[PDB]
């Protein structure tokens, strides 16, 4: 098996965790606390986000669907499909260093490409932004991940205040603007850390809203007197408050839709997570990557994890963490603050805290859009870094004038 699917929490590891908890007080921030390497998957958070994007076929179905209601369902299908793409063991992504970046691409079966660009925009508190686009299909995705980790006793939680904005550039609304979907994230809980075994749960409410429809999906939480893990329930409505469908089932098994105009009918299969197959992103080889590009930067750490050598993993991890600490001290001494290389700060009225700095006009030719994307950062094999890359986003935006 892969190390991501192997629980490495034996008697020794459980002692390390229990010991850390001993010094903790309920409500504590877990962001400022170094955690053992045996609960780490071999990915940065920047790459973990791409897991959720491994079903572009559903997204392509949505964009191609003419019926508004069915288009919404296909969007909901695309988004729900990615959550089971995760380690089977209770493990978490690496906490990306400040200014860390990650790029990847997809070779789509319709012989088009999908491009992905991301950057860790903040460390205290941790936060990252990502850009995703399939220009030849007029599909654009912008998002941020904002984890707020807390110790709560027998439970620890990562409250997810991030969100994702999906746009169909060639599908206009009542304003002439591209059809926009806003998708929030459920919270990630870990239970049974004190007494018993550890298990990861998704909880609370996920919202998906379009110009015409809206869906409040609840990720139900398992109780003591039971039962069932991983259950969801929600409704698809228009803004007149009319209910069209009910979603049910399990986000890691099979999810169903029940047509509410047929009150006697039984919920039919909406998404089988065992049926369709995920499409993994492609990445440049290490020999082309930058010093603080995710996979290269963490290479020594992931190598050690891949063979379960934790003394070495913790050591290599510490070196990286300690260097960043040094850099933070130097910034204070020089009287400067960090500025993202690839993402600008939000303007008033926008949906996200960060947005890709490159201006990509809505009704521009897809070929020229791809050209603009490739100028942002090295994505495809053979692409070369430039001096412009390391210039802060806000300076690059000051330019173009
Ligand atoms: C009390 C012990 C509990 C042990 C449990 C063990 C494992 C549970 C595994 C899964 C998570 C489960 C639930 C979450 C519950 C609470 C635990 C949160 C875990 C957590 O705070 O890690 C922390 C990092 O901050 C995240 O990493 C925040 C990221 C949180 C990751 C969870 C999110 C996973 C789901 C991702 C889905 C993505 C959604 C995609 C959105 C849709 C896209 C379309 C700490 O770790 P760490 O040593 O790598 O981080 C270090 C950091 O590397 C170092 O530089 C810092 O030094 P300084 O501070 O001196 O510089 C140091 O303070 C510390 O930050």
What does this structure look like?
This protein has a 15-stranded antiparallel β-sheet that branches. The chain has one domain (1-401). It is 24% helix and 31% strand. Helix 6 (299-306) runs antiparallel to helix 7 (310-334). The chain has helices spanning 11-22, 45-51, 56-64, 68-81, 294-297, 299-306, 310-334, 366-374, 387-390, 393-398; strands at 40-44, 92-94, 101-107, 113-122, 127-134, 139-145, 147-151, 156-160, 163-172, 178-184, 187-191, 199-209, 213-220, 231-238, 243-250, 254-259, 268-272, 343-345, 354-356. The protein is α+β, with helices and mostly antiparallel strands. The relative contact order is 0.14. The longest helix has 25 residues, at 310-334. It has 10 helices and 19 strands. Ligand 2Y5 is lined by residues 17, 21, 30-35, 39, 48-49, 52, 90-95, 126, 143, 145, 147, 149, 151, 156-158, 164, 185, 188, 190, 193, 200, 321, 324-325. The PDB classes it as lipid transport. Keywords: Transport Protein, Osh proteins Phosphatidylinositol Phosphate Lipid transport, lipid transport. The assembly is monomeric. The entry is titled "Structure of Osh6p in complex with phosphatidylinositol 4-phosphate". The protein is Oxysterol-binding protein homolog 6. Organism: Saccharomyces cerevisiae.
Sheet bearing the most strands, described?
Answer: 15 strands, antiparallel
- Taken as a percent bin, the fraction of beta residues is 25-35%
List the helices and strands in order: HEHHHEEEEEEEEEEEEEEEEHHHEEHHH
As a whole number of angstroms, the C-alpha radius of gyration is 22 Å
How many β strands by DSSP?
19
Q: Please state the overall shape, judged from the principal axes of the Cα atoms.
A: globular
Straight-line N-to-C gap: 55 Å
Question: What small molecules are bound in this structure?
Answer: ligand 2Y5
Structural class: alpha+beta
Helix content percent band: 10-25%
* Structure annotation, total helices: 10
Question: Please, how many domains?
Answer: 1
Organism: Saccharomyces cerevisiae (strain ATCC 204508 / S288c) (Baker's yeast)
Catalytic activity: a 1,2-diacyl-sn-glycero-3-phospho-L-serine(in) = a 1,2-diacyl-sn-glycero-3-phospho-L-serine(out)
Family: Belongs to the OSBP family.
GO molecular function, one term: phosphatidic acid binding
């Amino acid at each position: 098996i892969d190390t991501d699917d192997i629980d490495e929490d034996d008697e020794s590891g459980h002692n390390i965790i229990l010991n850390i908890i001993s010094q903790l007080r309920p409500g504590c921030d877990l962001t400022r606390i170094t955690l053992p390497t045996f609960i780490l998957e071999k990915k940065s958070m920047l790459e973990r986000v791409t897991n959720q994007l491994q079903f572009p076929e559903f997204l392509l179905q949505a964009h191609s669907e003419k019926d508004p209601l069915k288009r919404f369902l296909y969007v909901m299908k695309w988004y729900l499909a990615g959550w089971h793409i995760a380690p089977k063991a209770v493990k978490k992504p690496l906490n990306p260093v400040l200014g860390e970046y990650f790029t990847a691409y997809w070779d789509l079966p319709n012989k088009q490409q999908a491009y992905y660009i991301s950057e860790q925009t903040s460390h205290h508190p941790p936060e990252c932004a990502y850009f995703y686009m399939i220009p030849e299909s007029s599909i654009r995705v912008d998002g941020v991940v904002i984890p707020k980790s807390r110790f709560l006793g027998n439970s620890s939680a990562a409250m997810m205040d991030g969100s994702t904005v999906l746009q169909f550039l060639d599908i206009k609304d009542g304003n002439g603007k591209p059809e926009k979907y806003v998708l929030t994230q459920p919270n990630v809980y870990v239970r049974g850390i004190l007494f018993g075994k550890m298990r990861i749960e998704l909880g609370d409410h996920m919202i998906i809203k379009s110009p015409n429809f809206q869906a409040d999906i609840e990720f139900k939480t398992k109780g003591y007197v039971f039962g069932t893990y991983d259950a969801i329930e929600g409704t698809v409505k228009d803004y007149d408050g009319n209910a069209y469908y009910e979603i049910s089932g399990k986000w890691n098994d099979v999810m169903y839709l029940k047509d509410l105009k047929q009150p006697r009918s039984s919920p039919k299969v909406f998404l089988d997570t065992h049926k369709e197959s995920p499409l993994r992103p492609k990445v440049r080889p290490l020999s082309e990557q930058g010093e603080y590009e995710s996979r290269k930067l963490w290479k020594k750490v992931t190598d050690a994890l891949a063979v379960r050598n934790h003394p070495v993993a913790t050591e290599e991890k510490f070196q990286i963490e300690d260097h960043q600490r040094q850099l933070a001290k130097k910034r204070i001494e020089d009287g400067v603050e960090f500025h993202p290389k690839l993402f600008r700060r939000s303007k008033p009225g926008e949906d996200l805290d960060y947005c890709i700095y490159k201006n990509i006009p809505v009704d521009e030719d897809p070929e020229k859009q791809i050209r603009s994307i490739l100028q942002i950062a090295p994505i495809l094999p053979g692409q070369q870094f430039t001096d412009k890359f390391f210039i802060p986003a806000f300076e690059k935006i000051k330019s173009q004038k």
